[PDB]
Design a protein around this ligand. Structure first.
Ligand code: HEC
Ligand code: HEC
Ligand code: HEC
Ligand code: HEC
Ligand code: HEC
Ligand code: HEC
Ligand SMILES: [Cu+2]
Ligand SMILES: [Cu+2]
Lengths: 259, 259, 251
């Protein structure tokens, strides 16, 4: 106990414990690192203010109610209870779990995860023929059979597969070396797809699995194929590590408290 | 219909009914088109936040009371009731009518209509001699008589008429061909003035009469001469179709409900 | 005199009393000039909103409480009484005085005074060897121990220009705010000597805290890491000062 915020700051400026890289810095090093408590009052404002996590209309316009005709998915982001409840319209689901890191919970993917193939517009269907094919393949336990090789593998290497005028996934995900291949993810072979991302620069048994056999809902490929970044139409190049995103995550790790 | 937002959406991307042009898109096709209900809470934030409709101070600073010594025109934009009442200081007048399209109501012109001649500074009087002349000419039924040709017609073709270092209207409004004449409006002759704008590339059925004989208050000419765009000093080139404006308009058409 | 806001305006467009220079103008000529009353409701929104005075996180995040372990300096900017009270943590002190101009008060300096040397990062210490050397000299009311620090590169932190880089002459361009930091007299005369006997005094002997030099050396502009070139006369700053001068009223 006992040592003040001011006291640690004076000590950390002294030790060089504060590192400054593309500030931002004020937030990572003085707010998150020292685990300062975030009031719901600030979070409420975030969901209610246009451009709060990146370019686009305020979240509560489209998600301002638990009535599915007044709000998409009957998701009410405008109150603390509404946030904690998540989507109401069938199929109902929480968009995060209080006290747990939401980085990969639904609210996190919707704020940070660009839909794939990178740049594809939201008015392309998320239940098209190929997506549904990939879905069934994952359900099937993600087999390396004849069917996969002829009917599934080329989806990652063929132009205009998931919408008009879009590049094959293989354009950007084709090796295990970062530069030039993003997240060290290789989608050219079965072996590469099941291996997943970040397999070199951070373990190989600690790879970020991108297909989870039997569970399409949790498979990062399927998610990126079917989930549009919010607010709809946001440009993929907008900061995925926006301070407001981070502060929101912090408030959730702290218990998503209502005061 | 009794169909939910989500359902309308999954149906609209499939059919291709969603058109994307320079977002904007999220707002026009998902918010306005689907007739989503706008809460007063958001509107309040619009009038209380600086730069909400384009660059400048928050509206409620200058319009925060029905007491004419605390607020210009005794106009209170800070409460729902204040909005509905409008300007209180004599001459008292509503600034919109609940349930009616406000695009050309007082609130609409003050957000979207740049004062003419374009760019003229707001510290130029709005009751100068030329304006009053034009006012009276419209009161008289806008005759094409001897008087008009001599005393009124040149007011649109003479530099520095409505203020210092301002170009003649005739600089930008001189034919019915857009490029080069703005809004296809011609102020060089009586015939052109009564004809009005937008009569050509979209026909005589999208014509916009710009002088309404017997009513200066309703004549778009008189309006542009006397009404400074808000907040004062806002650059003419600021988006005249700001999303928050479009949302403000929507809330008014829905009835300006206070919850 | 008993004319409404609207009436004063019409008289002022007519009189030419309204002057427009790089707007900005609406707030200086219509809000501040006519002393429109500023509501606390707006002021609260200012401390609660990110980027309200320039780039950076909202003030009430780091200063949201009178508990020095939940808010820096035990300063609560999130309530009206919190504001008036100021810093709770020792040394406890108010950050402004209601009814008095706050421009060079603590809240004003933190909004408007870029830390020196210009551009210096906030993770550089403010009780380092050179600065502490200087603190005692002002307390004392020389040439070898104090003076050279203003013409020396990398004095107060790594990769920083010597103060003399920007303050080396008598008039404005190329010397900012007409201040010359190379000699004893230029330092005691102060800035804006072109002045010359009402020049903005920059050192107050016996009082480090009111000496503008000590202030700029030890006080980081808020929010921390804000780029020095961000408008130092932000309209929201000006409105806040207006609210303080009006009595810092809570209703
Ligand atoms: C309309 C203009 C929207 C705005 C503004 C925001 N979102 Fe949204 N959201 C919108 C649609 C059409 C959908 C898909 C609906 C469907 O039935 O498929 C979504 C989806 C979400 C979700 C996921 C819902 C779920 O998994 O059950 C989330 C978590 C979400 N949106 C959040 C969100 C946030 C945080 C926003 C502001 C930054 C935001 N949305 C804006 C439409 C619109
Ligand atoms: C470049 C033009 C790309 C194409 C084509 C595809 N993706 Fe992509 N991917 C790209 C980037 C820049 C990123 C990083 C995140 C960001 O939005 O900037 C990603 C990431 C993924 C991931 C997540 C990886 C993780 O470690 O969590 C997945 C699962 C993914 N990409 C899959 C994927 C698929 C299936 C694609 C084709 C349909 C595809 N990507 C195309 C860039 C590009
Ligand atoms: C002062 C700094 C102002 C700010 C900020 C805004 N407005 Fe304003 N407004 C101001 C003046 C000096 C005037 C004209 C006064 C006169 O006596 O003629 C106006 C006028 C309006 C009106 C017209 C109402 C009428 O009855 O004629 C409207 C509807 C209006 N202003 C709205 C408005 C909005 C929406 C603002 C924010 C975007 C806004 N004003 C800012 C002074 C100031
Ligand atoms: C160019 C430098 C212009 C001068 C000089 C004047 N106006 Fe104009 N006007 C201009 C533009 C670009 C527009 C479109 C709206 C915008 O703000 O960008 C207009 C519009 C009008 C209108 C309304 C037209 C409509 O379709 O409703 C009117 C009635 C009008 N302008 C009249 C007008 C008068 C009387 C002028 C001289 C005092 C004048 N304009 C100058 C560009 C320019
Ligand atoms: C953390 C991320 C902060 C944000 C956001 C803001 N400020 Fe701050 N402030 C912060 C620190 C680390 C310090 C120094 C602490 C120390 O012990 O020296 C300060 C200091 C101030 C002060 C001075 C208080 C005093 O007693 O002298 C003031 C008046 C101040 N800060 C105000 C302020 C404002 C107005 C902010 C938003 C615009 C703001 N701070 C943001 C940390 C952080
Ligand atoms: C530029 C490269 C600078 C260096 C190096 C130093 N200062 Fe400076 N100073 C600079 C500017 C552009 C300004 C104007 C205000 C602003 O923040 O932009 C200032 C201001 C001061 C003042 C106050 C002047 C006044 O009229 O009140 C002081 C007292 C001051 N600066 C002192 C100072 C010291 C002690 C420096 C080195 C240790 C120093 N300055 C370096 C630009 C630059
Ligand atoms: Cu302890
Ligand atoms: Cu029906």
């Amino acid at each position: 106990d006992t040592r003040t915020l001011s006291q640690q700051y004076l000590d950390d400026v002294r030790s060089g414990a504060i590192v400054i890289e593309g500030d931002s810095a004020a937030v990572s090093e003085l707010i998150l690192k020292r685990d300062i408590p975030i009031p719901y009052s600030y979070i409420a404002q975030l969901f209610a203010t246009p451009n709060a996590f990146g370019s686009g209309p305020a979240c509560i316009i489209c998600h301002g109610s638990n009535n599915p005709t007044h709000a998409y998915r009957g998701l009410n982001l405008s109150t603390c209870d509404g946030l904690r409840n998540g989507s109401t319209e069938q199929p109902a689901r929480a968009i995060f779990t209080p006290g747990e890191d939401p980085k990969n919970a639904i609210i996190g993917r919707r704020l940070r995860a660009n839909r794939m193939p990178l740049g594809i517009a939201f008015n392309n269907p998320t239940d098209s023929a190929p997506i549904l094919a990939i879905k069934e393949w994952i359900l099937a336990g993600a087999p390396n059979d004849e069917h996969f090789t002829k009917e599934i593998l080329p989806l990652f290497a063929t132009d205009n597969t998931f919408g008009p005028d879009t590049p094959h996934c293989t354009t950007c995900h084709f090796s295990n070396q970062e530069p030039p291949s993003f997240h060290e993810l290789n989608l050219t072979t079965y072996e590469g797809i099941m291996l997943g991302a970040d397999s070199v620069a951070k373990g190989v048994d600690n790879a970020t699995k991108v297909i989870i056999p039997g569970d399409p809902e949790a498979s990062k490929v399927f998610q990126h194929l079917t989930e549009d970044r919010m607010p709809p139409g946001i440009d993929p190049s907008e900061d995925r590590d926006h301070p407001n995103t981070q502060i929101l995550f912090a408030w959730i790790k702290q218990g998503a408290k209502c005061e």
